Design a protein around this ligand. Structure first.
Ligand SMILES: CC(=O)NCC(=O)N1[C@@H]2CC[C@H]1c1ccc(Nc3ncc(C(F)(F)F)c(NC4CCC4)n3)cc12
Length: 289
């Protein structure tokens, strides 16, 4: 396990575990304070006794995280054992997920473009490292209190090599999964680009396509239907960004690097600092109730 700490280190001493902020890839996630620096962190806690077929996946997740050095990937600080519980210390992103920031109401196209541009920067980094996220969706897109946008939850992240230029494993969240991943055909990083497209619709409309239906229906709906399109009063460049991602033929989908030059992004995206308005809005909203 990369970043595994000295097992004599007691994380209950080194860290103040605060409120739960979410349920994660495995186990729960908490807000916490690093007791040495007084920096806030995120703590993922997993019971190893309450495992197992997950520990390979937990190894794999932590391995992948430890191999990423990008402003666009959640930082991983190390892991601690406390009796049966694994404490995974993560970068704390105080804005929550893009999905949280949607709860007060719709995004405008500038905010959508900005968030998509930053996701594309993350996807470009990952894909350049032959890594595939495979669970891109709004809930896995996090923001710092400054409005920086980062990719999270590498629970099902894949790795490509010289040997394996392609993967076949059935992973992801159904609504966001690419048809070729659902069919377990040979696939690569283009799968993430399909997921990005679904996420673009999610960011624009609040939900992915087929969100009313039972997840098992999409197992045939997605491979046999025409891809979703963004329906509603949204700009033509936003609709074409979505369609460019959502092609059933993976070689017809652009790369992350290409989509960064897409007209929707260029014409509408602004500096990420402006996303603070979106976090302030969430605050005010969450005040009431
Ligand atoms: C009591 C209270 O108000 N707590 C804060 C809270 O509930 N928040 C804030 C704003 C929305 C929601 C929330 C969710 C997530 C975070 N931050 C965060 N940072 C890093 C991770 C990381 F573990 F990926 F690194 C992470 N993961 C959780 C698992 C579901 C998302 N969440 C912050 C918040």
């Amino acid at each position: 396990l990369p970043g595994m700490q000295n097992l004599k280190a007691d994380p209950e001493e080194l860290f103040t575990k605060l409120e739960k902020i979410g349920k994660g890839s495995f186990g729960e996630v908490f807000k916490g304070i690093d007791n040495r620096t007084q920096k806030v962190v995120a703590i993922k806690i997993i019971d190893l006794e309450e495992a197992e077929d997950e520990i390979e996946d937990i190894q794999q997740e932590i391995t992948v995280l430890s191999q990423c050095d990008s402003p666009y990937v959640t930082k991983y600080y190390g892991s601690y054992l406390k009796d049966t519980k694994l404490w995974i210390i993560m970068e704390y992103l105080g804005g929550g997920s893009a999905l949280d920031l949607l709860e007060p109401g719709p995004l405008d196209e500038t905010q959508i473009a900005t968030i998509l541009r930053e996701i594309l920067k993350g996807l470009d980094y990952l894909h350049s490292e032959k890594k595939i996220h495979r669970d891109i969706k709004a809930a896995n897109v996090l923001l710092s209190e400054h409005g920086e946008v980062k990719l999270a939850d590498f629970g099902v992240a894949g790795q490509l090599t010289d040997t394996q230029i392609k993967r076949n494993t059935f992973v992801g969240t159904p609504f966001w999964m690419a048809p070729e991943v659902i069919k377990q055909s040979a696939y690569d990083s283009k799968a993430d680009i399909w997921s990005l497209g679904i996420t673009a619709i999610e960011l624009a409309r609040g939900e992915p396509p087929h969100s009313e239906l039972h997840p098992m229906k999409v197992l045939f709906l997605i491979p046999k239907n025409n891809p979703p399109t963004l329906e509603g009063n949204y700009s033509k460049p936003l609709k074409e960004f979505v369609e460019a991602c959502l092609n059933k033929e993976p070689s017809f989908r652009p790369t992350a690097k290409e989509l960064l030059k897409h007209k929707f992004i260029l014409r509408n995206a602004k500096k990420t600092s402006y996303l603070t308005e979106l976090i302030d809005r969430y605050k005010r909203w969450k005040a009431e109730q």
